[PDB]
């Protein structure tokens with residue numbers, strides 16, 4: 001299928017209307033970030049030749 | 051099959067036709083002795099970076 005970017009939302013804009021929240025949600029979301037790799041070393045002579 | 055390693059007894063059970071053994075990295079780790087039908091685990095000699 002041709003992908004849909006998102007669901008339609010025509011915001012009800014006008015020159016004298018404002019939307020003020022009457023409640024709220026405390027949202028907890030995760031972010032995963034890699035920090036380090038495995039520290040590897042090579043004995044170049046031993047690897048190439050044994 | 052020639053190389054260097056430390057030979058110890060192994061609890062792996064070879065099938066009777068098999069002679070050599072390889073790990074995930076396709077390196078030899080066990081060989082069956084031609085004289086006595088026993089399986090010797092070959093771990094590499096303990097190298098390290100000084």
Ligand SMILES: *[C@@H]1O[C@H](CO)[C@@H](O[C@@H]2O[C@H](CO)[C@@H](O)[C@H](O)[C@H]2NC(C)=O)[C@H](O)[C@H]1NC(C)=O
Pocket residue numbers: 010011012013019
């Ligand atoms: C504020 O009012 C506008 C219109 O007076 C609302 O907009 C309508 O919203 C409904 C459902 O959300 C839609 O079916 C209509 O098509 C919208 N009309 C227009 C002209 O946009 C709006 O939802 C209201 N906002 C709140 C928070 O109640």
Ligand SMILES: *[C@@H]1O[C@H](CO)[C@@H](O[C@@H]2O[C@H](CO)[C@@H](O)[C@H](O)[C@H]2NC(C)=O)[C@H](O)[C@H]1NC(C)=O
Pocket residue numbers: 022023024025
């Ligand atoms: C604001 O929203 C919260 C939830 O997001 C409302 O708390 C709920 O209230 C109803 C009835 O008042 C309870 O049945 C739910 O168990 C409550 N949920 C939680 C998570 O506590 C709260 O009432 C809303 N306040 C206003 C003024 O709208």
Ligand SMILES: *[C@@H]1O[C@H](CO)[C@@H](O)[C@H](O)[C@H]1NC(C)=O
Pocket residue numbers: 084085086087
């Ligand atoms: C070879 O000789 C050894 C020592 O006598 C013996 O243990 C073994 O059974 C013989 N046969 C084979 C097929 O290894």
